[PDB]
Design a protein around this motif. Structure first.
Motif, mmCIF file in Angstrom:
data_model
loop_
_atom_site.group_PDB
_atom_site.id
_atom_site.type_symbol
_atom_site.label_atom_id
_atom_site.label_comp_id
_atom_site.label_asym_id
_atom_site.label_seq_id
_atom_site.Cartn_x
_atom_site.Cartn_y
_atom_site.Cartn_z
ATOM 1 N N UNK A 184 0.827 -1.200 0.000
ATOM 2 C CA UNK A 184 0.000 0.000 0.000
ATOM 3 C C UNK A 184 0.865 1.255 0.000
ATOM 4 N N UNK A 185 1.932 1.259 0.812
ATOM 5 C CA UNK A 185 2.761 2.451 0.981
ATOM 6 C C UNK A 185 3.658 2.679 -0.224
ATOM 7 N N UNK A 186 4.276 1.619 -0.747
ATOM 8 C CA UNK A 186 5.328 1.772 -1.740
ATOM 9 C C UNK A 186 5.060 1.119 -3.086
ATOM 10 N N UNK A 187 4.011 0.308 -3.222
ATOM 11 C CA UNK A 187 3.859 -0.483 -4.437
ATOM 12 C C UNK A 187 3.753 0.364 -5.690
ATOM 13 N N UNK A 188 3.029 1.484 -5.610
ATOM 14 C CA UNK A 188 2.913 2.363 -6.768
ATOM 15 C C UNK A 188 4.276 2.888 -7.193
ATOM 16 N N UNK A 189 5.107 3.297 -6.222
ATOM 17 C CA UNK A 189 6.417 3.839 -6.572
ATOM 18 C C UNK A 189 7.346 2.756 -7.114
ATOM 19 N N UNK A 190 7.345 1.565 -6.496
ATOM 20 C CA UNK A 190 8.185 0.471 -6.998
ATOM 21 C C UNK A 190 7.823 0.142 -8.437
ATOM 22 N N UNK A 191 6.526 0.080 -8.735
ATOM 23 C CA UNK A 191 6.097 -0.271 -10.078
ATOM 24 C C UNK A 191 6.501 0.805 -11.071
ATOM 25 N N UNK A 192 6.242 2.067 -10.730
ATOM 26 C CA UNK A 192 6.542 3.136 -11.673
ATOM 27 C C UNK A 192 8.040 3.270 -11.876
ATOM 28 N N UNK A 193 8.802 3.273 -10.775
ATOM 29 C CA UNK A 193 10.244 3.446 -10.892
ATOM 30 C C UNK A 193 10.895 2.219 -11.515
ATOM 31 N N UNK A 194 10.395 1.030 -11.185
ATOM 32 C CA UNK A 194 10.920 -0.175 -11.809
ATOM 33 C C UNK A 194 10.745 -0.167 -13.315
ATOM 34 N N UNK A 195 9.527 0.122 -13.781
ATOM 35 C CA UNK A 195 9.299 0.093 -15.221
ATOM 36 C C UNK A 195 10.122 1.164 -15.918
ATOM 37 N N UNK A 196 10.266 2.321 -15.277
ATOM 38 C CA UNK A 196 10.981 3.434 -15.898
ATOM 39 C C UNK A 196 12.455 3.123 -16.054
ATOM 40 N N UNK A 197 13.078 2.634 -14.982
ATOM 41 C CA UNK A 197 14.484 2.247 -15.010
ATOM 42 C C UNK A 197 14.737 1.138 -16.039
ATOM 43 N N UNK A 198 13.917 0.089 -15.996
ATOM 44 C CA UNK A 198 14.089 -1.055 -16.895
ATOM 45 C C UNK A 198 14.039 -0.626 -18.364
ATOM 46 N N UNK A 199 13.009 0.135 -18.731
ATOM 47 C CA UNK A 199 12.885 0.595 -20.108
ATOM 48 C C UNK A 199 14.083 1.454 -20.480
ATOM 49 N N UNK A 200 14.469 2.368 -19.597
ATOM 50 C CA UNK A 200 15.533 3.300 -19.955
ATOM 51 C C UNK A 200 16.863 2.580 -20.147
ATOM 52 N N UNK A 201 17.185 1.635 -19.273
ATOM 53 C CA UNK A 201 18.505 1.022 -19.360
ATOM 54 C C UNK A 201 18.575 0.057 -20.542
ATOM 55 N N UNK A 202 17.490 -0.692 -20.806
ATOM 56 C CA UNK A 202 17.509 -1.589 -21.966
ATOM 57 C C UNK A 202 17.530 -0.803 -23.275
ATOM 58 N N UNK A 203 16.814 0.318 -23.336
ATOM 59 C CA UNK A 203 16.883 1.128 -24.556
ATOM 60 C C UNK A 203 18.297 1.647 -24.776
ATOM 61 N N UNK A 204 18.916 2.182 -23.721
ATOM 62 C CA UNK A 204 20.302 2.608 -23.820
ATOM 63 C C UNK A 204 21.186 1.450 -24.271
ATOM 64 N N UNK A 205 21.167 0.332 -23.530
ATOM 65 C CA UNK A 205 21.963 -0.831 -23.940
ATOM 66 C C UNK A 205 21.725 -1.193 -25.396
ATOM 67 N N UNK A 206 20.467 -1.156 -25.846
ATOM 68 C CA UNK A 206 20.199 -1.626 -27.210
ATOM 69 C C UNK A 206 20.654 -0.649 -28.282
ATOM 70 N N UNK A 207 20.804 0.634 -27.949
ATOM 71 C CA UNK A 207 20.980 1.625 -29.003
ATOM 72 C C UNK A 207 22.239 2.473 -28.919
ATOM 73 N N UNK A 208 22.972 2.467 -27.811
ATOM 74 C CA UNK A 208 24.010 3.477 -27.591
ATOM 75 C C UNK A 208 25.400 2.905 -27.399
ATOM 76 N N UNK A 209 25.587 1.588 -27.434
ATOM 77 C CA UNK A 209 26.889 1.076 -27.038
ATOM 78 C C UNK A 209 27.528 0.241 -28.129
ATOM 79 N N UNK A 210 26.977 0.279 -29.337
ATOM 80 C CA UNK A 210 27.593 -0.367 -30.464
ATOM 81 C C UNK A 210 27.197 -1.805 -30.636
ATOM 82 N N UNK A 211 26.118 -2.243 -29.997
ATOM 83 C CA UNK A 211 25.615 -3.565 -30.304
ATOM 84 C C UNK A 211 25.166 -3.619 -31.757
ATOM 85 N N UNK A 212 25.594 -4.730 -32.408
ATOM 86 C CA UNK A 212 25.293 -5.086 -33.792
ATOM 87 C C UNK A 212 24.157 -6.098 -33.780
ATOM 88 N N UNK A 213 22.949 -5.640 -34.074
ATOM 89 C CA UNK A 213 21.819 -6.557 -34.057
ATOM 90 C C UNK A 213 21.714 -7.349 -35.340
#
Ligand SMILES: CCCCCCCCCCCCCCCCCC(=O)OCC(COC(=O)CCCCCCCCCCCCCCCCC)OC(=O)CCCCCCCCCCCCCCCCC
Ligand SMILES: CCCCCCCCCCCCCCCCCC(=O)OCC(COC(=O)CCCCCCCCCCCCCCCCC)OC(=O)CCCCCCCCCCCCCCCCC
Ligand SMILES: CCCCCCCCCCCCCCCCCC(=O)OCC(COC(=O)CCCCCCCCCCCCCCCCC)OC(=O)CCCCCCCCCCCCCCCCC
Ligand code: HEA
Ligand code: HEA
Ligand SMILES: CCCCC/C=C\C/C=C\C/C=C\C/C=C\CCCC(=O)O[C@H](COC(=O)CCCCCCCCCCCCCCCCC)COP(=O)(O)OCCN
Ligand SMILES: CCCCCC/C=C\CCCCCCCCCC(=O)O[C@H](COC(=O)CCCCCCCCCCCCCCC)COP(=O)(O)OC[C@@H](O)CO
Ligand SMILES: CCCCCC/C=C\CCCCCCCCCC(=O)O[C@H](COC(=O)CCCCCCCCCCCCCCC)COP(=O)(O)OC[C@@H](O)CO
Ligand SMILES: CCCCCCCCCCO[C@@H]1O[C@H](CO)[C@@H](O[C@H]2O[C@H](CO)[C@@H](O)[C@H](O)[C@H]2O)[C@H](O)[C@H]1O
Ligand SMILES: CCCCCCCCCCO[C@@H]1O[C@H](CO)[C@@H](O[C@H]2O[C@H](CO)[C@@H](O)[C@H](O)[C@H]2O)[C@H](O)[C@H]1O
Ligand SMILES: C[C@H](CCC(=O)O)[C@H]1CC[C@H]2[C@@H]3[C@H](O)C[C@@H]4C[C@H](O)CC[C@]4(C)[C@H]3C[C@H](O)[C@]12C
Ligand SMILES: C[C@H](CCC(=O)O)[C@H]1CC[C@H]2[C@@H]3[C@H](O)C[C@@H]4C[C@H](O)CC[C@]4(C)[C@H]3C[C@H](O)[C@]12C
Ligand SMILES: C[C@H](CCC(=O)O)[C@H]1CC[C@H]2[C@@H]3[C@H](O)C[C@@H]4C[C@H](O)CC[C@]4(C)[C@H]3C[C@H](O)[C@]12C
Ligand code: CUA
Ligand SMILES: [O-][O-]
Ligand SMILES: [Cu+2]
Ligand SMILES: [Mg+2]
Ligand code: NA
Lengths: 105, 144, 227, 73, 46, 84, 514, 49, 43, 58
Positions: free
Chosen positions: H6-35
């Motif tokens: 009740x106290x933290x679930x909304x923040x964990x969900x929002x911050x979790x999804x935000x971090x996950x999307x941001x870091x995977x997008x960076x990893x996928x597009x900014x470090x020279x991975x050859x897809x």
């Protein structure tokens, strides 16, 4: 294989036994709610009167709860049941879970 | 709140929608007032006040059906935490790409791939569906 | 050869490979259906407050869950075995070619008339000509006539290998002391690639197969040219 | 407005199961038809169409002209 | 006879959670690390 | 061998019925399927009047003396060949 | 007292705890090897070396995961802890021999380690086929140490099988027939019969490889009249039963978990579940040559092995539908163990179905020795055997330890693992259909995208493994002691409390015959 | 009473999804991975011979 | 299941420590070997 | 020979707390120590041999 009518009558007889004891009351309800059915009002009526003979008001309320619970999403079963039981509820002074506020978290 | 350890060998209380009448009462040791309420219960229940009926119920049961069936916000923590750790994994992958992996072979360079692609079309690689099928050999372009 | 982001089989180059494509489509439809039914029923079992916890009788329903899978298995096995016996049929080839596996390259022998033999090595990445394929090219390809039934004989002079050409539907293990036969028929000219398919040591990943399919008259010209 | 009529009270779980197993069958039937059109017949047509007027000599000559062959320059 | 009950039916102590953390870290960590160091050994050998 | 199954404790009717319906009759059903798939006549071979076959040292005591007891015109030639 | 208790044990619970610890440690080793595999393949080119070092890693990965993680955890660990409790027995039949089955495993693992440290390792595949595994292509001690490792693991499991069969037949309450014993007990009994019959054949085959390598026999050497294909028959006569050995105790655990968290007193169709496990065990002995469809066998033999392999789908489907029918009508408790078991039912089914694809010897020509096979068996192993292990571990951890896990953390762990294994292995179907071979350190460029994604999935599963360790720590760190669990009337192993006393059932249960 | 979720679930969900999307997008597009995506519709074929 | 309250409760701060230590114990040794791969392939 | 089983029954049922592998007396302890010393020493020695065989030698 028995008819619905013979099944219901066995369960009415079960709960109507005058000297039914507390163990048999619990065994009865706990067994019945295992089946794929909501018990007929005539069954619930006998079980509520067993509660009266065993001076157990709380279990009478609980029995109304599990009747509602066994209907799942079929919202029309419980009001029909309560309607069929209202004479007994009045005679015995059984308050419904809703009248006691036990239906709200 | 720190109970007993012969409990495993004795009947115990459970709130279970399919076991509505548990083996023991919620409240085992009654006070004098509570004992008096149980005595009143042997008389007509119509004479019981609502407050008193609730107290009889709460002597016998811990949670009502509505209470034991409540939904929770746990899924938010579970899903959010899982996404956090899946996000953390991408940090490991970034680290691996930066410090472990060297350059990939020259065959991935844009000019090599352009030439390789023509040679594959020239040999009609997968001409029925897979690859060359998607080239327009007349118009000299990818089929739109 | 495979291409980037490929999901399914390489395009069929032989009639038998086309048969396998159509048989895979049939079987994958069944796999998808059964997988999805099981997933659906899981969700169905988990999405109701209605209960039934007393003993359930199992006999009637188990007839259905044995008979229906039995029928499905037969409906897979019937076309599967048809293709199997098709592959095995007598076909009388017009050409026999042997290949011998080695650590780590293939050799080929064409000894129906002339005694032609040669070795076939991967082109190192540092020697690829521009636009050629990393790990797949060889210096000497298996020149073969298109649209003709060819007998390939496979063995090995050292450890196990396996001679494979996925777009022709071919994979035959190369076993020393044993001479394994398979039949090869390409509907089209072109270049057809495969790779060693039994772990064979240090350079297992680096001893590919390349067929070069050409018209008969061009095959005869090539053979004549080797005298 | 007057008295409530008696709803079905027996076999509610079995009734739900039967309804949805039938539904699942219908969907399966449906999907089998989609897959035959969009995958299996599609593939049969693509191969039949490719080969119906295919000229293997012409195909070879095009490849030969592009320099793809070792044995036929 | 032997000791019985939670935390007593195991060959490692849980009396102190930080000592335990060191133990478990050494235990699982050593298994996870071993293949990396064997690979390094084979690479360095020759 | 222990076969691959494995269920004793005091052998009994229940176990042998289990075996009858769970292994024996299913195997018969599988073999019945296998046989109905591979039935269908095979080409009768060319007739060759081999002297070690279609032996007649004494007429048979039934029929015209020259037909075996379960003679099948489709697949059993006479010493002179297949009947018309 | 510590040495007496933990090195000289004759106690089924402590020996089960030893197996669980051993198998967990082995799981870390096998996980590290799997990450080295996926690091090599995570971009095109070469990371570590050529195929020798790479396939030493692959070979060790498989042996550790199968012989040192799955079988010790399921059979030595859950089997020793649960089987005696579930039949009210006071220990195993041969409590001292049981301890030797355990202590043979650290030496077995040491021999595997030694194989990888001497010379250039055994880069053979876990199948160890000659001639690659012979003394010319694998000269030196590595392959012989590998053979000896298998010999000790084999003796460990054979003696353990003898112990489990004897215990289960001989030590039930006198009123309890075999048709009153729990399904997990059945699953261990049948697994034990498969081990008893299959491991001695493996032992024969690898002993012939040892003598070909060291005593100048030629069982598998054509120069002497031997045949490499004979080794394959002997190996797979064991190796197909072996995969049913890897999954059967998992089936038994899944039956208990699904029953429990559906709020049921019993699994649906008990006798059908017994029948199905016995049928699978029997059919598992007559299908081995589906590992050999490309070696040159006659067409009629390929037809028989195609057909006999597919028939195993029938009893297996009975179990899958019976689990679904056990869920049916349940008061579902969405515990972490339930999540493992539901993931099991679906993902095991996908993997079983791609097994049925491979059973078709005509299609197997093109799929054999490709990543399609790798996808098949990691769905039934990484998402079947392992999911049953994780579900049983989370379910029974409070029984073995006396402490509860944090359910929210355990659900997070499930969620991470589910994503990781599916990202790792689902694209491998595409790699297989499109022709990427097995046992390759590098691949043609076209295969890059799916190898890249698969390796990314393997790191997500690594994060789950690390989190599990933390979750076990947190439970022992916080010390929430169990009081009661529900459903003890149909789950006897819980009725002596958590953890049960060192000696249980000193007075046996009372069970009468009516 | 309100629990952790009740106290933290909304923040964990929002911050979790935000971090996950941001870091995977960076990893996928900014470090020279050859897809290595399909060249179909992407690459201009260039003369090689 | 029911259980007594934790004998030695593990606060969110203690959990962050346990988690961090656990993850580091897996990551740092493998990381060190993989970081130095080039240094190994040349000796 | 004469039947002396009863005297061994008395010996091995003596209430002295000894586990069965030591209940025969001091000879048992010697044989145990010989066995365990050979096992543990031999195992240490096998570890030394691994270390030697793990590197290019001879
Ligand atoms: C409908 C059931 C279908 C199951 C079939 C699947 C079969 C195979 C796997 C079968 C696996 C089981 C699926 C779990 C469903 C949970 C309900 C609790 O409620 C109660 O009080 C008790 C009664 C429960 C009745 C259900 C009502 C639900 C209320 C709460 C809503 C839950 C929303 C969940 C939302 C979940 C969204 C994912 C609450 C905690 C839920 C934790 C969910 C973890 C799911 C992980 C799966 C991978 C996701 C990756 C995320 C990270 C990905 C990043 C890339
Ligand atoms: C019943 C409840 C639990 C049930 C569930 C189980 C729990 C599951 C998760 C488990 C969660 C808890 C993990 C606990 C860590 C154990 C400490 C003993 O430990 C203690 O005495 C600790 C407490 C007292 C301290 C004494 C001093 C110790 C100091 C240093 C010790 C370092 C330890 C690490 C040293 C590292 C060990 C290796 C005796 C036990 C034997 C078990 C086999 C181990 C694996 C060996 C593998 C073979 C190697 C071959 C090479 C193979 C080469 C590879 C190729
Ligand atoms: C939990 C998430 C973690 C993240 C990791 C991923 C998880 C996997 C989820 C992924 C969700 C899977 C849904 C079905 C996937 C089919 C993809 C496909 O197009 O497959 C094509 C075929 C070959 O097809 C061809 O030869 C022609 C293809 C092209 C058709 C023409 C269109 C041209 C453009 C193509 C666009 C794409 C079409 C797709 C259209 C899409 C239709 C659905 O490849 C194959 O056979 C691969 C088959 C593998 C065998 C297992 C099948 C049974 C699984 C059913 C449940 C899934 C469990 C997943 C495992 C668990 C999933 C939860
Ligand atoms: C847990 C381990 C496990 C299990 C249980 C299985 C189960 C099965 N396996 Fe698999 N298998 C392996 C582990 C396992 N396998 C391993 C490790 C290898 C590779 C070894 C190596 O080379 O290293 C392998 C290899 C392998 C091959 C060789 C492929 C090759 O190398 O070319 C084949 C071929 O037939 C095969 C088939 C099957 C089949 C038919 C099943 C069946 O038992 C599956 C039955 C289950 C179902 C079918 C799903 C549930 C059923 C239903 C829902 C009913 C309805 C379904 C239908 C009507 C189809 N397996
Ligand atoms: C049980 C068997 C098993 C398991 C679990 C795994 C797990 C994994 N495998 Fe495994 N693999 C094999 C058996 C297994 N594998 C076999 C037999 C082969 C063929 C070998 C050969 O070709 O010779 C193979 C081959 C193989 C290859 C092909 C190599 C090649 O052909 O070149 C790859 C590549 O991606 C791969 C990757 C992985 C990955 C990423 C995992 C990951 O999913 C692993 C992730 C981690 C876990 C699943 C955790 C494990 C730990 C525990 C469960 C302990 C838990 C602790 C407690 C309960 C206390 N494996
Ligand atoms: C149908 C399913 C099988 C059921 C059994 C069928 C018959 C069993 C009868 C007894 C069998 C004992 C041996 C008799 C000898 C021959 C019978 C062999 C079985 C048989 O029935 O053989 C038939 C010939 O019968 C013939 O000659 C003649 C058949 C009748 C003549 C019997 C002659 C008397 C034999 C006396 C034996 C004395 C034994 C005493 C033993 C005491 C010790 C074969 O038919 P076919 O047309 O040649 O080929 C089939 C071509 N489509
Ligand atoms: C390449 C080189 C490989 C070398 C590998 C060597 C591996 C191991 C070294 C073995 C050392 C063995 C030491 C003696 C073991 C005796 C076990 C035994 O005899 O076990 C008995 C039970 O097994 C029974 O009967 C059943 C019958 C006895 C079984 C004895 C088996 C011995 C192991 C031999 C290997 C078998 C492999 C078989 C398949 C090929 C007794 O069981 P306990 O639990 O003890 O007691 C129970 C008490 O009630 C007894 O009063
Ligand atoms: C920038 C930020 C990065 C963050 C990264 C991490 C992301 C996600 C973290 C999500 C963690 C969720 C963990 C589970 C929390 C719920 C646990 C729960 O709900 O279980 C209950 C928790 O209880 C209670 O007080 C509540 C106890 C709550 C404990 C919460 C601890 C969180 C620890 C997080 C550690 C992260 C470390 C990150 C790296 C530095 C206990 O159950 P019972 O014993 O039955 O009841 C006992 C009652 O007396 C309790 O009052
Ligand atoms: C496949 C499973 C493997 C998972 C990947 C692990 C994820 C990363 C873990 C971090 O590992 C550390 O990384 C440092 C680099 O960030 C290294 O320091 C190295 O690099 C530093 C900076 O260049 C120097 O200061 C150090 O001396 C030098 O050791 C260090 O050794 C290593 O432990
Ligand atoms: C408690 C029980 C613990 C047992 C510990 C026993 C330790 C004895 C070790 O002695 C070694 O034995 C080697 C052989 O194992 C010798 O090599 C010798 O032996 C071989 C001949 O048998 C050949 O390699 C050579 O001739 C020669 O160098 C070597 O000199 C010596 O170091
Ligand atoms: C006879 C035996 C045990 C019955 C009992 O004593 O309880 C039962 C248990 C499982 C049953 C089998 C399984 O239910 C699977 C098959 C189901 C089909 O409906 C009949 C054959 C079928 C193969 C069954 C035959 C038989 O009824 C079995 C083998
Ligand atoms: C981090 C370390 C353990 C590291 C390890 O397990 O490897 C431990 C050892 C002693 C611990 C400290 C104390 O002993 C206990 C304290 C407990 C508080 O709730 C947190 C901080 C607290 C002040 C601890 C911080 C941290 O957990 C310490 C410092
Ligand atoms: C595979 C094995 C030979 C192993 C060997 O080479 O050592 C042989 C020996 C006996 C063979 C079987 C027997 O010949 C009986 C059957 C004959 C059928 O034509 C094929 C299936 C059939 C069931 C055979 C399958 C397979 O070829 C078997 C099992
Ligand atoms: Cu040659 Cu692999
Ligand atoms: O083995 O499947
Ligand atoms: Cu198999
Ligand atoms: Mg092979
Ligand atoms: Na690589």
């Amino acid at each position: 294989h028995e008819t619905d009518e013979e099944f219901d009558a066995r369960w009415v007889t079960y709960f109507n036994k005058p000297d039914i004891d507390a163990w048999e009351l619990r065994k009865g309800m706990n067994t019945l709610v295992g089946y794929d059915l909501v018990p007929e009002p005539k069954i619930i009526d006998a079980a509520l009167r067993a509660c009266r003979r065993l001076n157990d008001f709380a279990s009478a309320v609980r029995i109304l709860e599990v009747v509602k619970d066994k209907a799942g999403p079929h919202k029309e079963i419980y009001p029909y049941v309560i309607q069929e039981l209202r004479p007994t509820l009045n005679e015995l002074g059984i308050s419904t879970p809703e009248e006691l506020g036990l239906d709200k978290v | 709140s720190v109970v007993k350890s012969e409990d495993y060998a004795l009947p115990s209380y459970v709130d279970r929608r399919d076991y509505p009448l548990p083996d023991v009462a919620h409240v085992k040791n009654l006070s004098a007032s509570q004992k008096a309420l149980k005595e009143k219960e042997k008389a007509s229940w119509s004479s019981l006040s609502i407050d008193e009926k609730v107290e009889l119920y709460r002597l016998k049961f811990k949670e009502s059906f509505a209470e034991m069936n409540r939904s929770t916000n746990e899924w938010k923590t579970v899903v959010g935490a899982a996404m956090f750790f899946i996000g953390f994994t991408a940090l490991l992958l970034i680290w691996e790409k930066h410090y472990v992996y060297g350059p990939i072979p020259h065959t991935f360079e844009e000019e090599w791939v352009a030439k390789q692609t023509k040679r594959m079309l020239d040999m009609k690689v997968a001409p029925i569906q897979g690859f060359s099928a998607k080239w327009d050999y007349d118009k000299n372009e990818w089929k739109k | 050869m495979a291409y980037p982001m490929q999901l399914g089989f390489q395009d069929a180059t032989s009639p038998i490979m086309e048969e396998l494509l159509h048989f895979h489509d049939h079987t994958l439809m069944i796999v998808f259906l059964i997988s999805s039914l099981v997933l659906y029923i899981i969700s169905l079992m988990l999405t109701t407050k209605l209960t039934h916890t007393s003993t359930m009788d199992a006999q009637e329903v188990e007839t259905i869950w044995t008979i229906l899978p039995a029928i499905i298995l037969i409906l897979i096995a019937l076309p599967s075995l048809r293709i199997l016996y098709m592959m095995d049929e007598i076909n009388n080839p017009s050409l026999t070619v042997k290949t011998m596996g080695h650590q780590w390259y293939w050799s080929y022998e064409y000894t129906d008339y002339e005694d032609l033999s040669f070795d076939s090595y991967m082109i190192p990445t540092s020697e690829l000509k521009p636009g050629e394929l990393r790990l797949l090219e060889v210096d000497n390809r298996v020149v073969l006539p298109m649209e003709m039934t060819i007998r390939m004989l496979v063995s090995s002079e050292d450890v196990l290998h396996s001679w494979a050409v996925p777009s022709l539907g071919l994979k035959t293990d190369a076993i020393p002391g044993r001479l394994n036969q398979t039949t090869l028929m390409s509907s089209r000219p072109g270049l057809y690639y495969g790779q060693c398919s039994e772990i064979c040591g240090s350079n297992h990943s680096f001893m590919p197969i390349v067929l070069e399919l050409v018209p008969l008259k061009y095959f005869e010209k090539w053979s004549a040219s080797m005298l | 407005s007057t008295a409530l009529a008696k709803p079905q009270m027996r076999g509610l779980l079995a009734r739900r199961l039967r309804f949805h197993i039938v539904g699942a069958f219908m969907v399966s039937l449906g999907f089998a038809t989609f897959y035959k059109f969009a995958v299996a017949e599609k593939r049969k047509k693509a191969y039949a169409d490719f080969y119906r007027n295919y000229d293997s000599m012409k195909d070879f000559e095009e490849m030969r002209k592009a320099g793809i062959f070792q044995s036929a320059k | 006879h032997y000791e019985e009950g939670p935390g007593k039916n195991i060959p490692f102590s849980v009396e102190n959670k930080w000592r335990l953390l060191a133990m478990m870290t050494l235990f699982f960590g050593s298994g996870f690390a071993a293949p990396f160091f064997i690979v390094r050994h084979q690479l360095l050998k020759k | 061998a222990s076969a691959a199954k494995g269920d004793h404790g005091g052998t009994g009717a229940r176990t042998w019925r289990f075996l009858t319906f769970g292994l024996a009759l299913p195997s018969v059903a599988l073999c019945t399927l296998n046989s109905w798939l591979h039935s269908g006549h095979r080409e009768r071979p060319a007739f060759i009047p081999y002297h070690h076959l279609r032996i007649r040292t004494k007429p048979f005591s039934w029929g015209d003396g020259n037909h075996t007891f379960f003679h099948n015109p489709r697949v059993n030639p006479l010493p002179t060949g297949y009947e018309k | 007292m510590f040495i007496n208790r933990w090195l000289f044990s004759t106690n089924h619970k402590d020996i089960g705890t030893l197996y669980l610890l051993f198998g967990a440690w082995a799981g870390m080793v096998g996980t590290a090897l799997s990450l080295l595999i996926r690091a090599e393949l995570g971009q095109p080119g070469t990371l570590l070396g050529d195929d020798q070092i790479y396939n030493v890693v692959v070979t060790a990965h498989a042996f550790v995961m199968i012989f040192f993680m799955v079988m010790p955890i399921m059979i030595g660990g859950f089997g020793n802890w649960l089987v005696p409790l579930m039949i009210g027995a006071p220990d195993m039949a041969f409590p001292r021999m049981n301890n030797m089955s355990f202590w043979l495993l650290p030496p077995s693992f040491l021999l595997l380690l030694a194989s990888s440290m001497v010379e250039a390792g055994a880069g053979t595949g876990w199948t160890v086929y000659p001639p690659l595994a012979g003394n010319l292509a694998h000269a030196g001690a590595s392959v012989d140490l590998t053979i000896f490792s298998l010999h000790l693991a084999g003796v460990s499991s054979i003696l353990g099988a003898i112990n489990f069969i004897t215990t289960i037949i001989n030590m039930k309450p006198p009123a309890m027939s075999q048709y009153q014993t729990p399904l997990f007990v059945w699953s261990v009994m049948i697994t034990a019969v498969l081990l008893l019959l299959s491991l001695p054949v493996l032992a024969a085959g690898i002993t012939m490889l040892l003598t070909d390598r060291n005593l100048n026999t030629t069982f598998f050497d054509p120069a002497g009249g031997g045949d490499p294909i004979l080794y394959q028959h002997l190996f797979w006569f064991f190796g197909h039963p072996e995969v049913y050995i890897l999954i059967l105790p998992g089936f038994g655990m899944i039956s208990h978990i699904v029953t429990y968290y559906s709020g049921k007193k019993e699994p649906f169709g008990y006798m059908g579940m017994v029948w199905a496990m016995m049928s699978i065990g029997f059919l598992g002995f007559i299908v081995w040559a589906h590992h050999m469809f490309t070696v040159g066998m006659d067409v009629d033999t390929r037809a028989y092995f195609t057909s006999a392999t597919m028939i195993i789908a029938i009893p297996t489907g009975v179990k899958v539908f019976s689990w679904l029918a056990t869920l049916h009508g349940g008061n579902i408790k969405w515990s972490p163990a339930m999540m493992w078991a539901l993931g099991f039912i679906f993902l095991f089914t996908v993997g079983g179905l791609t097994g049925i694809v491979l059973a078709n010897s005509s299609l197997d020509i093109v799929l054999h020795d490709t990543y399609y096979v790798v996808a098949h068996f990691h769905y039934v192993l990484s998402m079947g055997a392992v999911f049953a292990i994780m579900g049983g571990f989370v379910h029974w951890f409070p029984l073995f330890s006396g402490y509860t896990l944090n359910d929210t953390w355990a659900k997070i762990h499930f969620a991470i693992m589910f994503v990781g294994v599916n990202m790792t292995f689902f694209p491998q179907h595409f790699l297989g259909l499109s022709g990427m071979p097995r046992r390759y350190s590098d691949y043609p460029d076209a295969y890059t995208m799916w190898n890249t994604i698969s390796s990314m999935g393997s790191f997500i599963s690594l994060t789950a493994v690390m989190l599990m360790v933390f979750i076990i720590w947190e439970a022992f760190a916080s010390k929430r002691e169990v009081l009661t669990v529900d459903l003890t009337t149909t789950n006897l192993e819980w009725l002596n409390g958590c953890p049960p006393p060192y000696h249980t059932f000193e007075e046996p249960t009372y069970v009468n015959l009516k | 009473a309100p629990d952790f979720h009740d106290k933290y679930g909304n923040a964990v969900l929002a911050s979790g999804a935000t971090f996950c999307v941001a870091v995977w997008v960076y990893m996928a597009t900014q470090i020279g991975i050859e897809w290595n995506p399909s060249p179909v519709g992407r690459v201009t074929p260039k003369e090689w011979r | 299941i029911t259980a007594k309250p934790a004998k030695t409760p593990t606060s969110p701060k203690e959990q962050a420590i346990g988690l961090s230590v656990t993850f580091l114990s897996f990551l740092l040794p493998a990381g060190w070997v993989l970081y130095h791969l080039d240094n190994y392939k040349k000796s | 020979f004469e039947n002396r089983v009863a005297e061994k029954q008395k010996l091995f049922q003596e209430d002295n707390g000894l586990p069965v592998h030591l209940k025969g007396g001091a000879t048992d302890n010697i044989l145990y120590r010989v066995t365990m010393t050979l096992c543990l020493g031999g195992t240490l020695y096998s570890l030394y041999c691994l270390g030697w065989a793990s590197f290019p030698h001879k």
